[PDB]
Amino acid sequence: GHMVTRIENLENAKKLWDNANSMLEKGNISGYLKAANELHKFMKEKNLKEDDLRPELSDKTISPKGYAILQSLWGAASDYSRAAATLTESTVEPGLVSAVNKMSAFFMDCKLSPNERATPDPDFKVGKSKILVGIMQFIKDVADPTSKIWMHNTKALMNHKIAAIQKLERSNNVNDETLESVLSSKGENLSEYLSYKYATKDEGREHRYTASTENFKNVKEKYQQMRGDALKTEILADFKDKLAEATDEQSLKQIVAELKSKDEYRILAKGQGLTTQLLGLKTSSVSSFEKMVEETRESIKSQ
């Protein structure tokens, strides 16, 4: 087991920084943040500081275009941080977005002394929505699997917001008001969040065959005392969370195959009324699950 020189670690930090700058230059926001994050992780592990790396970057430059993107990123992040501070919740999401700012600042501080001014190209424009999606993608990548914003898993909420912003992009309805609604949302409306009209934590609808965990040997213990629409709501929520761990197309297909093999999925797929079972259509909850797979696919088919 084994040692590395300071020279050698600085040379690798220089490469990590270059990779970040290169992503910055191409306008790949999530790629830049991720690359910044790797630089920080590597430097922390080798006990290297920004001022150790700075002299070594003397032959490298953040372009004017680069500083313009970083200024837009800074602005979008500050604004998002404020917008995410809400009556429902104001600690986690703002903390996460302001930390994205601190990560970018770290990339800048490797190159610039404490008071040096950024020199952004004033003509270079970058769409607010591409920035926000990038921020959200980075937060989704880096937040702990157990992180929660209000009552919802953080990775899942990010994918939800990224899909909402992408829908605004596709239908040409992106403006400050529609972005604000997304940035300030915590998924308070459960039925929209899960894409399931009958989402509830209460008794929901009357059913001749109210969904039940009895007759499913393998169902997790947490569901055993839930029934009906509420049972399905809880299964869908946990499925949404598991789907949010997907990182690429192969990963998503694998997770989907796992979830569809579970007794919880058969509960979703089992109709709760006799007329409905005789029709031979997908249940509403299975439909919701399929929409979540599509949402997750869109939040991940991008970079």
Swiss-Prot record:
Transmembrane spans: none
Disulphides: none
Effect of mutating W74D: Almost abolishes GEF and GDF activities, but still binds Rab1
Region annotated P4M region, chain positions: 208-303
Region (Rab1 guanine nucleotide exchange factor): 4-184
Impact after mutating T283A: Abolishes PtdIns(4)P-binding
Subcellular location: Secreted; Host cytoplasmic vesicle membrane
Signal peptide start-end: none
Domain notes: The P4M (PtdIns(4)P-binding) region mediates binding to PtdIns(4)P and membrane attachment.
Family: Belongs to the DrrA family.
Subunit structure: Interacts with host RAB1A.
Known role: Virulence effector that plays a key role in hijacking the host vesicular trafficking by recruiting the small guanosine triphosphatase (GTPase) Rab1 to the cytosolic face of the Legionella-containing vacuole (LCVs). Acts as a GDP-GTP exchange factor (GEF) for the small GTPase Rab1 (RAB1A, RAB1B or RAB1C), thereby converting Rab1 to an active GTP-bound state, leading to the incorporation of Rab1 into LCVs. Also shows RabGDI displacement factor (GDF) activity; however, this probably represents a passive activity following the GEF activity.
Protein name per Swiss-Prot or TrEMBL: Multifunctional virulence effector protein DrrA
Species for this entry: Legionella pneumophila subsp. pneumophila (strain Philadelphia 1 / ATCC 33152 / DSM 7513)
Lineage: Bacteria, Pseudomonadati, Pseudomonadota, Gammaproteobacteria, Legionellales
Gene: drrA
